[PDB]
Amino acid sequence: MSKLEKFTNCYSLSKTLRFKAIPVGKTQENIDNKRLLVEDEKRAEDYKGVKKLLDRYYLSFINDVLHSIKLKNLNNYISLFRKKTRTEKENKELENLEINLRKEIAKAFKGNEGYKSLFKKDIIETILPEFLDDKDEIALVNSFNGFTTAFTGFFDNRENMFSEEAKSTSIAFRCINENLTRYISNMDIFEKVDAIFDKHEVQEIKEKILNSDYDVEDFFEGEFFNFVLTQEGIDVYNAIIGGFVTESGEKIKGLNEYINLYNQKTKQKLPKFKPLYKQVLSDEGYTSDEEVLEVFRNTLNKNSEIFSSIKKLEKLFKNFDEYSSAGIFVKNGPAISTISKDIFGEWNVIRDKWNAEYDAVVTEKYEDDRRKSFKKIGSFSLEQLQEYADADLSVVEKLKEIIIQKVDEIYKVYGSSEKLFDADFVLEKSLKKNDAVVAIMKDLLDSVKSFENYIKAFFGEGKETNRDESFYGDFVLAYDILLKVDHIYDAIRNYVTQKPYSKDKFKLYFQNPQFMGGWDKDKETDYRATILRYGSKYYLAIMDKKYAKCLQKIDKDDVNGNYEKINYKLLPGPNKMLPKVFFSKKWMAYYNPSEDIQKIYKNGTFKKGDMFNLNDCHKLIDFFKDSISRYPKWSNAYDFNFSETEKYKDIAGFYREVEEQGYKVSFESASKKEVDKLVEEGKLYMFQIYNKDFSDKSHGTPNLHTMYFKLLFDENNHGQIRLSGGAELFMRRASLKKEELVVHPANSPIANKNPDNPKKTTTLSYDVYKDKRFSEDQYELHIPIAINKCPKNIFKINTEVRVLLKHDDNPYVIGIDRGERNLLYIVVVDGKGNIVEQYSLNEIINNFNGIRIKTDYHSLLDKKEKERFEARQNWTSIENIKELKAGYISQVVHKICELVEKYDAVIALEDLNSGFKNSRVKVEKQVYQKFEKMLIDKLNYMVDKKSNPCATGGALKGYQITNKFESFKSMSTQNGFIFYIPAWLTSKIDPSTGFVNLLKTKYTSIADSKKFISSFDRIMYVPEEDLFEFALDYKNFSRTDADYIKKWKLYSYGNRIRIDWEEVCLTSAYKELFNKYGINYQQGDIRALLCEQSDKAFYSSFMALMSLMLQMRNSITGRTDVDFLISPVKNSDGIFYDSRNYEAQENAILPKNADANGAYNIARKVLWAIGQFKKAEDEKLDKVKIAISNKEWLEYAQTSVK
RNA sequence: AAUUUCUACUAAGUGUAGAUCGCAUCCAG
DNA sequence: GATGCGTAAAGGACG
DNA sequence: CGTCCTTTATT
Ligand SMILES: [Mg+2]
């Protein structure tokens, strides 16, 4: 009984192994003499070029078929599509009509005589040359005759366009699912808004755009949709909506622009047409320091157009008073928060302005509408913002001083960068080496980008009642120029952030278009590549084109050393392969197939479905079985032991056996003398398949992929991992010069970087060079493999994880959370919520032999954040921080893998599509999404390297506890052993009571504060405890529906940390407040006394003191010692939860800090979810809904504690 | 600071620890 | 964010 | 013929 070990051999997946390929002997000389590499580097260039020419015919071919087409179901489909109350029967009716529509488009493509020719040899040899009209391009297409086979991959990418399936690549899909659905939506919008388009306005568009061939109304009739399948037709339809610019250039207004004016001018909100997506085939980074510089000078010197639009916007905003503040608008969004701070000094007073009119009891159903309606608003006028502005304060004037300040900052930064615009300037050093120059460009780009990004707010996305077009004329003219800095900024950064070395490479064919296509022995002459082994070393051997058979003649040498030559036989896709060989002209003549058999095949009765007859399919199997016996190329290669025919449920049952039997890998001896002579003579090319684990000096644990590779040829491996075909060989030219490599000279001691390492310095007897692998040309060999090619343990993973979780008595849960003080923090929890392990993942502990050395990745990040501060916020420091986090999570994955194996444990993770990230966490959402993906990816085939490969958990019996990754949005609910959970109320919660603070202690008014105090059931001093007790029922406050216990007694117990910062003792601070105002707090119930007080400074200190008492999380930024969590509520035994009572202990039963509390409580929501499983029937476990609500959570957190 | 490749390394001396699905194509803001 | 290949053996063109 | 390139068959 182990949950983990029921998840092996569940599904097949493909992986690629990568290696360095080191030439052996005369191989590199022979390759150099034959000029093979130069051929392939050129071929790659021409191959990329021919693909674009090939596109042109494909594109032209699409227009011919799409123009001719006429869709049959159109009117019937659109109607059914529009019904808003469809029976489930009618929804399937729509799907059939939708499938038929796509099938009409696909069959129109594939029904041509021409369609088959496009992806055959013929397109390059004959069709394309006649199509082209340029002598040079025809020569290029001509260079690839006899090399058509190498285009297959491209051909497949184009075959996807003509599919009838509902797939992103398809033409039919773009027409029917996306463009039709949009067209229908535009028909709906058109009839509502039809009238507002002026009689004159339409007749324009018909002459100016339509050219008088069609009426604008036609484009919104359903039967007219055929015109818009082509890119030409789409351009016209989108032109009507967007507006057109003639050959003369006269601006022609679009229907969507008309609607804008109308809704604007009348302060209404009618809808606007969606434009149609492009057709599927209709129509790069800076490469050098000289190019990067050239753009910086050209676009940002003092007489560039961007600098011209800055001077115009300075003149425009200098005249800000001259314009109408009622017709100047600020877009609603982040820019409202910023501009609110800019002039008042306060983010949320402009919030209060609109709140002042809109603002007293708050049901959250009213609160959402209260909150939702303000979000609905598109923008605010300067007049509305001045309606906010208290008297004596001018919103326009101090906006002017802020904008003008930003342009003066640009001009000062220009003077500091001025020598970077001299025509005389030349670059002394490379930019990445040249921190000074990169800092100069960054400073100028930033000051302009910030000015651009700030000024962008003055839009109002209008859609806006009468706008000051005198202001928005000059403004729009200049801003459209200024917006060019966005593209410039991104490109220059992406260049500075790049690595110094280049991974550019080109594929090697050795003059074979199907080079190294597969490893099968029979095909080894055709492919001219194979695999040799000598002891521990492996080699890729390549026969030269003039001597393809040279390896086949070699025989074993008894006396001398021998290579091990691979003997690889595969029967790939028997369902594909078995018929073609047995129904081929060559074999059909040999073997008389009864008319029943060719019937069954032509009829399709063997295939599962309504046409299926078990006997018919059985008969076909026996046909295949006898023919395999008659076909000795297969029967002799594979020891076929088929199950008795009667047992087969379907044809796939027979095929599955064939597929699993049809694989065999062994080795044959081959004279090492004879083979080596072949290499010397130039007839054979030999590379060692190499990574650092194959080094003579290598010792200790190898790479996981080193194990997969060696296991391919291990006889303890039995199809668990298959060696796949389609391997590719590349050449990556060096991108660094050996002289320009950083060297640590031999016999001089090198300073070690890790603080925790005891050894501070290392001295070697040899030189070591940074990035040495890129100072030389390097072959790399990519090898695909197939794991669990024939899976036996077929079940839906999630349903199985749910069944085991239900019946498992003590389920273990691994809760992972992101902390402010901790990169990641782990809590392991048993089936009843008891903490089993809790610790931070700030330090990764690496194990080699018995030695342990830790790496504090949190200290690493801190040192790199400090390095970011120094040298401003340099472009690279951000990258270095990004990659360090990306390499950190690759360490964390292994730690999670151990815990999962150790505790047979289910993982609990945050749902990142619902929760909101505080940004106090170090690991931002973008890095965590990466992590949760890697997690999923590892758990498709979870393996412990140090385990023996044949054991479950080992490299041949990997755990499959997770389904293949789909999308970040799919990282929700559950993926096998991984559960995704909202982070809500997981940190600011008392773990010993489930208590949470649902009160709003923000001070608004004296009257608001009185109603707050009166809503408590009692407020009294407790002499026998020296505490103030606040009995409350949450029913008497608003937005308290989620809480379950409702009745709580708060206490002013212990200290809090007010935020600089000060420590506040709650009990004495209440006494201090009450004594300041003469309140007798010892006189039983005090509630009357506090409300009697008439001073506003009293209620503000009181609400502030309530805020602190209900502030359960207390921290000092920069003081990692102080992150304590303290509860104002007693538990069953009258104890207050204080996290510091447990951070002292080594094994604590409750969370040790706020960060541990989060991981603890993320894990507990899975426990609730397991509780939901144990409630349901085994059959309906699929139906159980995992997502926990804030109401369900608070009930579980407050009842399960006991 | 060496790497199939990435990060952290130097890990006891040409390397350590973990991770690593390649290749082509299309569509998106 | 999705597509598709990870192939041996039939089949044919060219000397 | 051979040899090299092409085309093919799909639960
Ligand atoms: Mg190692």
CB of A1009 within 7 Å of some strand D atom: no
Rounded distance between C-alpha atoms, residue A439 and residue A432, angstroms: 10
CB of A520 within 7 Å of some strand D atom: no
Q: Which of A507, A625, A744, A782 is catalytic?
A: A744
Query: Tokens 């028997």 map to which residue?
Result: A574
* Length A929 CA → B23 C1' (Å): 25
Rounded distance between C-alpha atoms, residue A628 and residue A582, angstroms: 9
Tell me whether residue A984 is exposed, middle or buried, using C-beta atoms within 10 angstroms of its C-beta: 0 to 12, 13 to 18, 19 or more.
buried
CB under 8 Å to A154, separation ≥6 — which residues?
A51, A54
A698 CA from centroid of ligand 1 (Å): 8
Residues annotated within the binding site of A for Mg(2+) are: 701
Query: Tokens 């040298």 map to which residue?
Result: A871
Say if strands A906-910 and A978-981 run parallel, antiparallel, or are unpaired.
parallel
DSSP state of A276: P
Are A772 and A15 in contact by the 8 Å Cβ rule? The answer is: no
Rounded distance between C-alpha atoms, residue A1082 and residue A1029, angstroms: 12
Question: How is residue A679 written in tokens?
Answer: 């290499």
Q: Calculate the alpha carbon distances from A1100 to A349, A1090, A1094, A1104 in Å.
A: 18, 12, 12, 6
- CA A709 to centroid of chain Cα atoms: 29
A966 CA from centroid of ligand 1 (Å): 31
Q: What is the DSSP string of A389-455?
A: SPTT--HHHHHHHHHHHHHHHHHHHHHHTGGGG-TT---SS-TTT-HHHHHHHHHHHHHHHHHHHHH
Which residue type occupies A2?
S
* Length A170 CA → B26 C1' (Å): 9
Rounded to the nearest 10 degrees, the angle between the axes of helix A36-68 and helix A135-142 is: 110
CB of A298 within 7 Å of some strand D atom: no
Q: Calculate the alpha carbon distances from A960 to A485, A814, A971 in Å.
A: 48, 18, 17
Question: How is residue A424 written in tokens?
Answer: 């005389």
The sign one gets for the Cα dihedral A754, A756, A759, A760 is: positive
Listed in sequence order, the DSSP H helices in A69-118 are 74-82, 88-110, 115-118
How many residues are recorded in chain A? 1202
- In the complex, which nucleotide's C1' lies nearest to the CA atom of residue A724? C6
| Nearest CA among A683, A373, A362 for reference residue A543 | A683
Q: What angle do CA A925, A926, A932 make, to 5 degrees?
A: 80
* A812 torsion bin: left (phi>0), alpha (psi -120 to 50), beta (else): beta
Return chain A residues 533..552 having CB < 7 Å to nucleic acid strand D.
545-546, 548-549
For chain A, how long is the longest CA-to-CA vector? 113
Rounded distance between C-alpha atoms, residue A407 and residue A405, angstroms: 6
User: Going along A314-417, which residue ranges are E strands?
Assistant: 329-331, 379-381
Are A58 and A118 in contact by the 8 Å Cβ rule? The answer is: yes
Rounded distance between C-alpha atoms, residue A169 and residue A1002, angstroms: 54
CB of A120 within 7 Å of some strand D atom: yes
Q: What is the phi/psi pair of residue A362, to 5°?
A: -120, 90
| Nearest CA among A662, A573, A590 for reference residue A626 | A590
Residue nearest to nucleotide B1 (CA to C1'): A770
Q: Is A743 helix (H, G, I), strand (E, B) or coil?
A: strand
Please report which helix (H) or strand (E) contains residue A910, including its range: strand A906-910
Rounded distance between C-alpha atoms, residue A923 and residue A857, angstroms: 12
Are A975 and A25 in contact by the 8 Å Cβ rule? The answer is: no
Resolution of the structure, angstroms: 3.7
Strand B positions with any atom < 7 Å from protein CB? 1-28
Cβ neighbour number for residue A195 with a 10 Å cutoff? 7
DSSP state of A1085: B
* Length A148 CA → D6 C1' (Å): 8
Question: Catalytic: A422?
Answer: no
Rounded distance between C-alpha atoms, residue A675 and residue A39, angstroms: 26
Tell me whether residue A251 is exposed, middle or buried, using C-beta atoms within 10 angstroms of its C-beta: 0 to 12, 13 to 18, 19 or more.
exposed
Strand D positions with any atom < 7 Å from protein CB? 3-11
DSSP state of A125: I
User: Going along A830-896, which residue ranges are E strands?
Assistant: 835-840, 843-848, 851-856
Preceding-residue numbers of gaps in chain A (C–N over 2.5 Å): 283, 359, 1059
Q: What is the DSSP string of A753-800?
A: --SS-S--EE--SS-EETTGGGSS-EEEEEEEEEETSS----S-HHHH
Q: Which of A452, A1123, A1155, A1165 is catalytic?
A: A1155
Q: What is the phi/psi pair of residue A723, to 5°?
A: -80, 120
Q: What is the DSSP string of A991-1057?
A: TTT------------HHHHHHHHHTSSEEEEETTTTEEEEEEEGGGSSS--S-SS-EEEEE--SEEE
A703 CA from centroid of ligand 1 (Å): 6
A715 CA from centroid of ligand 1 (Å): 24
Are A239 and A250 in contact by the 8 Å Cβ rule? The answer is: no
Please report which helix (H) or strand (E) contains residue A1199, including its range: helix A1190-1199
Q: Is A908 helix (H, G, I), strand (E, B) or coil?
A: strand
- In the complex, which nucleotide's C1' lies nearest to the CA atom of residue A18? B4
Identify any residues that bridge with A751 across adjacent strands, giving them in sequence order. Answer: A761
Say if strands A529-534 and A537-543 run parallel, antiparallel, or are unpaired.
antiparallel
Strand C positions with any atom < 7 Å from protein CB? 1-12
Q: Which of A910, A932, A990, A1123 is catalytic?
A: A910
Rounded distance between C-alpha atoms, residue A1080 and residue A1088, angstroms: 11
Q: What is the phi/psi pair of residue A498, to 5°?
A: -60, 165
Q: Calculate the alpha carbon distances from A1083 to A59, A650, A899, A1109 in Å.
A: 89, 87, 57, 22
- In the complex, which nucleotide's C1' lies nearest to the CA atom of residue A783? B22
A881 CA from centroid of ligand 1 (Å): 25
Question: How is residue A1079 written in tokens?
Answer: 């309140």
Identify any residues that bridge with A787 across adjacent strands, giving them in sequence order. Answer: A13, A721
CA dihedral of A740, A742, A744, A745, whole degrees rounded to 10 = 10
Question: Catalytic: A1155?
Answer: yes
Residue nearest to nucleotide B16 (CA to C1'): A848
Rounded distance between C-alpha atoms, residue A934 and residue A38, angstroms: 38
A693 CA from centroid of ligand 1 (Å): 7
Please report which helix (H) or strand (E) contains residue A664, including its range: strand A663-671
Q: What is the DSSP string of A182-237?
A: HHHHHHHHHHHHGGGS-HHHHHHHHHHTSTTSS-GGGGGSGGGGGGGSSHHHHHHH
Are A1137 and A773 in contact by the 8 Å Cβ rule? The answer is: no
Say if strands A813-817 and A906-910 run parallel, antiparallel, or are unpaired.
parallel
R_g of chain A computed on alpha carbons = 37
* Length A1025 CA → D4 C1' (Å): 97
A706 CA from centroid of ligand 1 (Å): 10
Query: Tokens 């604008």 map to which residue?
Result: A216
Question: How is residue A924 written in tokens?
Answer: 């931002």
- CA A754 to centroid of chain Cα atoms: 32
Rounded distance between C-alpha atoms, residue A542 and residue A529, angstroms: 4
- In the complex, which nucleotide's C1' lies nearest to the CA atom of residue A168? C2
CB under 8 Å to A939, separation ≥6 — which residues?
A900, A959, A960, A961, A962, A976, A977, A978
Q: Which of A770, A792, A1002, A1191 is catalytic?
A: A770
- In the complex, which nucleotide's C1' lies nearest to the CA atom of residue A758? B11
Please report which helix (H) or strand (E) contains residue A879, including its range: helix A875-903
3-state secondary structure A707-742: HHHHHHCCCCCCCCEEECCCCEEEEECCCCCHHHCC
The sign one gets for the Cα dihedral A20, A26, A29, A30 is: negative
| Nearest CA among A1119, A1147, A1163 for reference residue A821 | A1119
Rounded distance between C-alpha atoms, residue A889 and residue A922, angstroms: 13
